[PDB]
Design a protein around this nucleic acid. Structure first.
Lengths: 366, 205, 258
RNA sequence: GUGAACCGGAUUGCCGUCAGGAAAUUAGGUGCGCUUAGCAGUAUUCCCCACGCUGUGGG
């Protein structure tokens, strides 16, 4: 089984992700321009969220030397330690492993008086064996050493971690409407001042974004070993964080902290997406609004897919979440969902109950 | 009827040249007689070992005529082989893009008629040199006729466009085999040799 | 006999196949540039999958090392002009700018299985061949190429599956000889099915005689983007279910079920 | 069954920190919509049917 999560969100004028030149990211779908927020931005914002803090037990970085240096009273663990570092095969490339392992094992191996090759190989095995963390399971990992400038005696073990989450780039459900803001910077003390003024150009846009998430339960459980309660807690906390977290872009200037107006959760055995419902851009008419029209097009696409591909040996069910039941998916007659909820905590409860005999308080212990 | 008309049209096609001995595979600017004869051998339902026994020389004896409606584009592809298994092999395969050809074979009337009849419904599949190039136009789209010279046979077929507009080439490339004529008559200055004479299914002259 | 399968699809901003330099592979046809997918990806995406695994079965379909396999596939192409884009990313430190490229385009898939070849390769077995036919149909319909999934979750389902029984193997690449643009009254997918349906609308009036006609079973998601967007009877039956389509094919040819 | 058949460029990535477009403005000066008429003192009421050489019945 595989967990799917769809979202329909509207944002105020903001700039959550920008390119080199300082403009909101855009793409082409259906022959028309659309705004986009990158997947890496969403993953990073979710990873460093207040609702994901209890499961943040890993670090990706290049300052591995400064981490061991903090875990020692002796100031003689700076250099040559950076040579145990600069020989496992590392050009200051960013390394990813469990945080709880480094501050013990790197200290216990580095501070001993032994050979360079032996200590380097021990630390290499420690790094390649440090996978016990939820973020490593979710966002995967590849680590490659530089064979051109590495010790010829040391050997690396398997360090490939398969990710268990797929996040699609946010795609606007309508055409893109970029905008330009002209700003000036004022001087407190009066005087001659400049001439025409240092007019700048800040770019921003607002769009209704169709977000698409997917968590593979089996792979996440395998990655976290025989433990399953930890995986259930991770899934619940991840869902909560995704519902209640936003990218930290130009937020001090645009407080676009809006929350989604519609969530559809479906448990499938195969990846399914609903991004083709927006190949025809949404145009606003005097009745209804952008969000309701987008949800209607989504409902058309889902019921088309259902009345298309269907199997009796593998049935599927869904829950549609709108705050206090304000935006219905099957608004006319269709009961596409089975257990419609107006609450998000009850959504987590239903998801956990479908997963297994997991209660949230029971799994808030690992 | 002395010749039967066949069409080789699709998104891609391939007519390999003699310069294929390593991972880099190449093609020619026109179809070869060996590929056409292999297509025919597939068409009438003959295996790779039965074709060598008194079946290929009859097809090889027929005259060669091919017309190129429009030129093509060679394209290089980064094909990889053996990834994740044991035998990562790498290779490069070249394809001719947006090209079409007309096939003409002049000789005995019975053989041409039998070839057209088998082309109406080939026993096995028919493709464009490689399994990854299906035909776009029917091969038997153009029924046989009676002609004296190969040039008249190739120029009698008209040229079909795709839409109302679009520029057209002002040269229609056509290729024929060199007729020996009278006994002797050594090859002229502008004589070309292709390593494309099927002797077995590989052996070429 | 010949069983021709055709497929038209639209895809989200992604990179399903890139070359050695990191660019989405291209081609040339219809006088313009076209985004592409290899055939050696689509094959082995259908194959060696956990869905396709349902007298050695499936080896007659896909040979290994004079096996004479009976599974033939075409090449992917675009149905409009290609548009490349470049993504600019940076890496944090939680304690330099690269470039990644992507494109969105419409692509095609083709399958054809020789029934007589499949049965003969099974030492006279035909029920096993029919079961293999159903398994291949289900697996191909329910699988996608394994591209950059974890970053570009491009998982759009096919928007059209057309089944024919022509006497000769022919692909319909000559439908999109012109680029397919967008107007205010249409999108890509609705224009894609119509012009492919225009190809079936033509030809049949000025080609192979009705004494030996060609039948087919049409599949579309809940009868949307309908093959033959009119009252024309170009298709014997339009089907909105995969299992029903497999049952229809089994009934026509061998006679069987699922 | 074609210099062909068996054939995956694959895995790894926050563009982040900062910004008053501001100071000053009447759209004002000119114009007839005017000449005309019983819902009533009649001389066939548009169509259909029966009864007489005008009286009943339906639209």
């Amino acid at each position: 089984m595989l967990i799917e999560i769809h979202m329909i969100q509207n944002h105020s004028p903001a700039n959550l992700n920008r390119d080199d030149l300082g403009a909101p990211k855009t793409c082409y779908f259906g022959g028309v321009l659309r705004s986009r927020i990158s997947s890496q931005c969403i993953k990073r914002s979710i990873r460093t969220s207040n609702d994901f803090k209890a499961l943040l037990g890993g670090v990706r970085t290049r300052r591995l030397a400064d981490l061991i240096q903090q875990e020692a009273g002796e100031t003689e663990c700076w250099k040559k330690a950076q040579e145990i570092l600069n020989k496992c095969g590392f050009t200051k490339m960013l390394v990813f492993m469990s945080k709880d392992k480094i501050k013990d094992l790197a200290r216990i191996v580095l501070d001993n008086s032994l050979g360079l090759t032996e200590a380097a190989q021990q630390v290499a095995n420690v790094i390649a064996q440090a996978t016990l963390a939820p973020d490593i399971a979710l966002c995967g990992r590849m680590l490659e050493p530089n064979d051109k400038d590495k010790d010829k005696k040391v050997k690396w073990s398997n360090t490939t971690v398969e990710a268990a989450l797929q996040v699609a780039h946010a795609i606007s459900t309508h055409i893109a409407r970029p905008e330009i803001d002209y700003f000036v910077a004022a001087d407190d003390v009066p005087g001659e001042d400049a001439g025409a003024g240092h007019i700048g150009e800040s770019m921003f846009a607002s769009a209704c974004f169709y977000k698409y998430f997917s968590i593979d339960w089996e792979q996440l459980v395998k990655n976290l070993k025989g433990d399953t309660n930890l995986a259930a807690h991770t899934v619940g906390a991840f869902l909560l964080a995704a519902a209640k977290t936003n990218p930290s872009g130009k937020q001090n200037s645009f407080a676009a902290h809006n929350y989604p107006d519609g969530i559809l959760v479906e448990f499938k055995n195969s990846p399914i997406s609903y991004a083709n419902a927006f190949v025809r851009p949404v145009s606003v008419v005097k009745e209804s609004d952008l969000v309701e029209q987008s949800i209607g097009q989504l409902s058309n696409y889902v019921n088309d897919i259902r009345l298309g591909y269907y199997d009796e040996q593998s049935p599927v069910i869904g829950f549609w979440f709108s705050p206090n039941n304000r935006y219905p998916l099957g608004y006319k007659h269709s009961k596409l969902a089975s257990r419609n909820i107006g609450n998000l905590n009850e959504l987590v409860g239903a998801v956990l109950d479908y997963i297994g005999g997991f209660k949230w308080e029971e799994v808030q212990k690992s | 009827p002395n010749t039967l008309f066949l069409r080789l049209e699709g998104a891609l096609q391939s007519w390999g040249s003699n310069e294929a001995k390593f991972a880099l595979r190449r093609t020619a600017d026109a179809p070869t007689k060996s590929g056409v004869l292999g297509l025919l051998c597939a068409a009438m339902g003959i295996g790779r070992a039965e074709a060598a026994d008194s079946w290929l020389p009859k097809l090889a004896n027929l005259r060669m005529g091919v017309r190129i409606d429009r030129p093509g584009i060679r394209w290089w592809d980064f094909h990889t082989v053996g990834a994740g298994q044991r035998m990562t092999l790498l290779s490069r395969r070249e394809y001719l893009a947006d090209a079409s050809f007309l096939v003409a074979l002049q000789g005995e009337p019975e053989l041409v008629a039998k070839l057209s009849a088998a082309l109406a419904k080939p026993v096995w599949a028919i493709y464009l040199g490689r399994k990854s190039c299906p035909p776009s136009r029917p091969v038997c789209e153009h029924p046989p006729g009676f002609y004296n010279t190969l040039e008249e046979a190739l120029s009698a077929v008209p040229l079909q466009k795709r839409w109302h507009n679009e520029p057209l080439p002002q040269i229609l490339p056509c290729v024929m085999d060199w007729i020996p004529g009278y006994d002797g008559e050594h090859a002229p200055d502008d004589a070309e040799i292709h390593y494309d004479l099927p002797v077995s299914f590989p052996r070429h002259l």
